[PDB]
Amino acid sequence: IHTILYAPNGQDVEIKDYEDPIRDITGVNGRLHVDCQYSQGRSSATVQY
Amino acid sequence: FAASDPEYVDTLFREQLLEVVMEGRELRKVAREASNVINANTRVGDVPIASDEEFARPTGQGAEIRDDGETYTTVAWNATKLTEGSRVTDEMRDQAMVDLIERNIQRVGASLENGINRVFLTELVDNAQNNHDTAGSNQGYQALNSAVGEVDKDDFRPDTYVTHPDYRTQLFNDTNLAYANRAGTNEVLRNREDAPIVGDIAGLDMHAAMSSATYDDGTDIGWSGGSETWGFSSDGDKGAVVYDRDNIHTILYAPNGQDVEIKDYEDPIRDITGVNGRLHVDCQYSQGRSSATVQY
Amino acid sequence: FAASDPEYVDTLFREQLLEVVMEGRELRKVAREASNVINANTRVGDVPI
Amino acid sequence: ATETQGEHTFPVEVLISGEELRGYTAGEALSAGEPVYLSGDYEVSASSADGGEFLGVNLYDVASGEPVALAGDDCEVRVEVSEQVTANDEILPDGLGTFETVATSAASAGVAIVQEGAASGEVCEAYIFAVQGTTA
Amino acid sequence: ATETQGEHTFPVEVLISGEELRGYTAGEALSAGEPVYLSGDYEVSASSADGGEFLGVNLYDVASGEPVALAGDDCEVRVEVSEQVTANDEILPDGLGTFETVATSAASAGVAIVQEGAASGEVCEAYIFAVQGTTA
Ligand SMILES: [K+]
Ligand SMILES: [Mg+2]
Ligand SMILES: [Mg+2]
Ligand SMILES: [Mg+2]
Ligand SMILES: [Mg+2]
Ligand SMILES: [Mg+2]
Ligand SMILES: [Mg+2]
Ligand SMILES: [Mg+2]
Ligand SMILES: [Mg+2]
Numbered sequence: 001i002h003t004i005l006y007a008p009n010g011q012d013v014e015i016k017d018y019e020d021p022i023r024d025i026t027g028v029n030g031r032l033h034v035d036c037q038y039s040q041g042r043s044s045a046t047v048q049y
Numbered sequence: 050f051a052a053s054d055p056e057y058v059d060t061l062f063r064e065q066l067l068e069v070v071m072e073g074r075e076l077r078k079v080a081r082e083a084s085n086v087i088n089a090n091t092r093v094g095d096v097p098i099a100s101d102e103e104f105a106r107p108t109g110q111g112a113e114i115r116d117d118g119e120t121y122t123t124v125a126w127n128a129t130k131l132t133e134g135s136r137v138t139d140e141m142r143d144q145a146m147v148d149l150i151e152r153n154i155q156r157v158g159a160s161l162e163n164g165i166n167r168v169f170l171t172e173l174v175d176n177a178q179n180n181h182d183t184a185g186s187n188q189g190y191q192a193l194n195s196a197v198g199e200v201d202k203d204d205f206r207p208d209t210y211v212t213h214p215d216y217r218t219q220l221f222n223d224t225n226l227a228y229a230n231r232a233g234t235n236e237v238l239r240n241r242e243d244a245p246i247v248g249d250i251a252g253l254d255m256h257a258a259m260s261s262a263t264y265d266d267g268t269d270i271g272w273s274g275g276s277e278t279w280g281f282s283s284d285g286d287k288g289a290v291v292y293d294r295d296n297i298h299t300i301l302y303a304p305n306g307q308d309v310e311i312k313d314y315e316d317p318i319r320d321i322t323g324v325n326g327r328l329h330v331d332c333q334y335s336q337g338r339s340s341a342t343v344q345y
Numbered sequence: 346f347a348a349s350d351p352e353y354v355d356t357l358f359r360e361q362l363l364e365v366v367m368e369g370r371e372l373r374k375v376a377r378e379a380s381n382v383i384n385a386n387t388r389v390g391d392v393p394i
Numbered sequence: 395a396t397e398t399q400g401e402h403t404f405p406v407e408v409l410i411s412g413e414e415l416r417g418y419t420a421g422e423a424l425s426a427g428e429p430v431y432l433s434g435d436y437e438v439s440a441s442s443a444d445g446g447e448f449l450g451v452n453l454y455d456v457a458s459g460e461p462v463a464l465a466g467d468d469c470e471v472r473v474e475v476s477e478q479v480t481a482n483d484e485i486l487p488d489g490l491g492t493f494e495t496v497a498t499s500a501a502s503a504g505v506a507i508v509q510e511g512a513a514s515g516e517v518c519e520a521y522i523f524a525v526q527g528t529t530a
Numbered sequence: 531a532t533e534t535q536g537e538h539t540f541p542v543e544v545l546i547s548g549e550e551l552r553g554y555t556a557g558e559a560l561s562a563g564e565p566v567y568l569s570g571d572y573e574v575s576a577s578s579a580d581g582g583e584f585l586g587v588n589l590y591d592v593a594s595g596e597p598v599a600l601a602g603d604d605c606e607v608r609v610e611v612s613e614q615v616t617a618n619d620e621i622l623p624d625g626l627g628t629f630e631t632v633a634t635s636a637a638s639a640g641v642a643i644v645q646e647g648a649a650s651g652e653v654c655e656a657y658i659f660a661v662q663g664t665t666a
Contacts, residue, residue, distance in 0.1 A: 008143035008320070016317040023551055029317060033140070039367035061366075063359040070357075073399070136347030136409070144350060144358045270510050270519065319415050321347055346409040346426065346453035346463070414604065416547070432618040435646040436655075447618070449643065449657075467659060468604065525659045527620040527643045530633035 001044065006033035066146050076260040078162050080169035082235045083209060083257035084299040084332065087126075088307045092329050095123040096298060098336075128302040128329035131164035133157050139320040150324060154311055157326035161309050163263070165330050169299055171265040171275040172332035173211060174287050179203065179341035185284065189219040190226065192343045196291040197251050199341040207339070209255040209294040215281030216288030216343065217258065226250065233258030255294060281345050292340035302329035395427045395474045395517050406517055408453050412469030414522070418449075420456045427473050428452040429487035429505075430464060432527070438462060443489035445501030448526045467522045470509065479518050483508040486526070493520070531563040531610045531653050542653055544589050548605030550658075554585075556592040563609050564588045565623035565641075566600060568663065574598055579625030581637030584662040603658045606645070615654050619644040622662070629656070 007014055018027040038044065050056075058064065080086075087096070100120040108114065135153040142149055179199040183192045193210065200207040212220065221231050230237065230248030234255045237244050250256070267274020281288030303310050314323045334340065346352075354360065395406040408427045409415075421439035424430060431447035433439035441447040450464030451471050465471055476488045477498055484504030488494040496504040505526055510519035531542035544563050545551075557575035560566065567583035569575035577583040586600035587607055601607055612628040615621060620640030621629040632640040641662060646655035 006140075008139040018317045020549070023549065027317070031320065040369070042370070059362075061362075063362050066355075066357070066359050138347060138349045140350050141348045141353065141357070145348075145353075146358050149348060149357065316413070319413065321415075346407060346465070349454055349463075351454045351456070352405055352426070416606075432643065432645060435617050437617070466657075525643050525657065527618045527640065528616070528631075528633070529620050529638060529640070530631075 002037050002039060004035045004037060007031075068146050070147050070152060075159070076163050076166065076263055077233060077236070077258055078166060079211070079233065079235050079257040079259055080162075080166045080299050080332075082238075083211065083255060083294055084169055084297045085295050087298050087300045089126065089128065089300050089302040089329075092128045092302045093126065094300075095125050096333070096335060098122050098124060124333050124335060126298075126300040126331040126333055128300055128331045129168070130327060130329050131161055131168075132325065132327050133160040133164075134323055134325040136321050136323045139322060142322050150313070150322070153324040154326075157311060157324055158309055161326050161328050165299065165301070165328070166259070166263050167265050167272070168330050169297075169332045170211065170259055170263045170279070172334065173290050173292065173297060173340065174264060174277045174279060174342060175275045176334050176337050177290055177292070177340040177342045178338040180344055181341055182344045185345065188281075188345070189216075189222050193220060193251055193289065193291065196289065196341040196343050197253070200291055200293075200339060203338050205293055205296070205336065205339040207291045207293055207341070208253055209257055209292055210251075210253050211257045211259050211290045211292070213259065213279055213281050213286075213288045214261050215286075219281060219288070230256050231258070232256075253291065277342075284345060286345040287342040288345055289343040290340055291343070293336075296336045296339035297332065297334050300331040300333065303327070395472065397517075406472050408451055408472055409465050410470035410472060410519060412465060412471075412522075414450070414466035414469045415453070416450070416464050416466055418462050418464055420452075420458055420460050420462045422458055424452040424456050424462060425491065426452060426454050427471075428491045429473075429493065430462075438464065440491060441487035441489065443487065443494075444499050445486050445503070445505075445526050446528060448487055448505045448524075450522065450525075465522065467505075467524060469522050471506070471520055471522060472517045473506070473520055475512050475514065475516065475518050477514050478512075479508045480511045481508055483511075485518075485520060493518070531608060533653070542608045544587060544607055544609070545601055546606035546608060546655060548601060548607075548658075550586075550602035550604040551589065552586070552600050552602055554598045554600050556594055556596050556598050558594050560588045560592050560598060561627065562588060562590050563607070564627050565609075565629065566598070567623075574600065576627060577623035577625065579623065579630075580635055581622055581639070582662050582664050584623055584641045584660070586658065586661075601658065603641075603660055605658045607642070607656050607658060608653050609642070609656050611648055611650065611652065611654050613650050614648070615644045616647045617644050619647075621654070621656060629654070 013030055013032050015030045103117055137149055181196040181199055197207055228247050229250045264279030265272050265275045278286045280286035309328045312325045397404040397406055418436050418438040421433040421437045429441040430438040430452055431441045431449050450466040453463040456462045474492045476492045476494050484496040485493040485506045486501055486504045505524045506520040506522045508518050508520050512518035533540045533542050554572055554574040557569040557573045565577040566574040566588050567577045567585050586602040589599040589601055592598050610628050612624045612630050620632040621642050622637055622640045624630040641660045642656035642658045644654050644656050648654035
């Protein structure tokens with residue numbers, strides 16, 4: 001099972017801080033691109049009630 | 050069968066995407082060679098113009114040397130800001146095989162240069178004091194000859210011709226002129242090395258071959274239009290300008306440095322990178338009687 | 346709109362293909378441990394009973 | 395919208411200027427330059443005619459259920475028109491993935507203003523100034 | 531406007547997105563998420579019903595005479611409603627510190643578009659797109 005992480009500016013979660021000097025606000029924002037995918041779905045079993 | 054690329058074309062490898070992006074239609078960049086370039090300190094200004102030269106006076110011995118001093122006037126420049134931008138997402142900037150920022154820097158640069166060329170060509174065509182009307186006859190060489198004739202008749206030395214694609218079809222219809230520098234002098238010096246030495250025509254040492262699209266007909270977005278029709282297809286179309294390149298001035302203003310300014314921005318709220326370009330440009334004849342247009 | 350992935354997914358870049366090929370089903374290999382192994386001198390031979 | 399340059403077709407850049415770029419989910423398949431309205435909670439679908447259905451223009455092609463970006467008001471945009479538009483014409487969605495003039499629609503006010511005129515089926519340059527929703 | 535997480539009630543963050551944040555003076559005591567209009571020179575009071583009285587929404591609690599931050603048009607906001615709103619409903623001030631639909635009000639055009647629907651007394655998510663002053 002593969003967790004696929006895409007980051008434009010690095011490896012992982014990008015946290016960008018911005019300063020608005022017109023309003024005196026600091027922004028903190030974060031981004032990641034994520035998918036998840038099996039290479040072999042036969043390598044897993046769900047347990048069902 | 051076995052294992053071949055037609056089966057696994059997306060499975061075991063990717064089709065190549067070439068790291069080089071091939072160009073669109075490129076319009077002919079001439080203005081920097083085809084005019085005198087002024088790096089202005091100010092967006093608005095004026096260039097001093099001197100009075101025409103006269104002749105010294107037959108004078109007696111011990112007689113007063115008389116005054117005919119240089120009298121002066123001026124032509125104004127008012128440099129218009131030409132701008133182009135491009136935006137790219139961070140995801141797009143990262144994923145591209147091509148350097149997308151470098152390309153956008155090229156596109157912006159190219160688009161600004163086309164702007165300079167538009168300003169130049171519009172000024173050159175609109176404000177030429179002389180004109181050879183062909184009246185639908187003797188077009189091509191007799192017209193170029195007559196247009197040199199008009200500049201020279203008014204005691205200016207033409208050294209350059211700017212030409213439309215249709216005029217370049219009427220000129221060079223003669224097999225005598227086949228060895229001429231039809232490509233443009235700037236094209237041969239930019240995009241070749243071994244220039245054919247013979248190629249100069251009518252004592253004009255520059256051919257500034259220019260594009261159909263370059264003149265300001267006001268049909269383009271944000272452009273207001275010039276007085277003439279750039280072409281060689283209907284009565285009244287200006288197909289060429291014969292002139293002195295030292296008597297038309299391209300005035301370039303930039304607040305930072307001397308030439309095109311590229312700025313970039315990162316938007317962290319939207320994850321967009323922008324590239325912006327700017328230059329301020331005017332074009333002015335110092336003497337417009339140094340130039341003749343060829344009219345269909 | 347500006348340049349973006351969904352517009353230029355197959356014109357400015359290629360979708361990644363992973364450098365590692367992921368393995369299929371591995372069958373259990375036990376016969377050599379699970380039996381008497383004869384490294385025979387001949388392709389045909391007899392065992393006395 | 396698309397641009398023919400010889401043998402080539404190019405995508406038209408929907409966004410001329412502005413930063414009113416906002417995230418929604420596509421309620422149907424949407425194409426770049428298409429006008430849209432809210433069909434559900436943060437879910438957007440293609441606008442119908444005669445107003446009351448406009449939030450912005452779709453920035454890039456999306457399938458149903460995918461995250462979409464829209465240009466909203468205070469964006470200048472490149473958009474396709476179903477009729478001749480001159481400068482200063484107010485425009486709103488035609489219901490055909492394109493825009494029409496307020497003058498042609500049954501609506502009395504628009505959502506964008508034409509800055510650069512265009513013929514039928516061609517790209518105008520317009521400024522988005524309003525959103526339109528359900529008034530009863 | 532307030533949010534529940536177990537036994538706890540939390541103050542709702544009025545601003546989802548936008549930068550149209552502007553300084554006024556309070557003409558009266560105002561609460562967060564309250565719709566407001568100009569009552570004097572750079573001075574804002576809480577809106578009455580039926581339109582003509584909207585500049586934005588108040589971003590934090592102020593006493594009378596204090597400096598207010600206002601979210602104008604171009605802001606996505608969490609706002610309280612007096613009735614059921616669906617997405618794509620136009621809303622305007624109710625007169626009760628809340629928003630109501632254009633459909634319910636005696637007015638015919640709104641000031642925000644509902645992006646996420648809500649029941650009566652709950653918090654919708656809206657985009658402010660218009661201002662209403664006096665027209666006589
Ligand atoms: K606005
Ligand atoms: Mg004397
Ligand atoms: Mg004199
Ligand atoms: Mg002056
Ligand atoms: Mg003359
Ligand atoms: Mg004539
Ligand atoms: Mg011969
Ligand atoms: Mg045997
Ligand atoms: Mg915004």
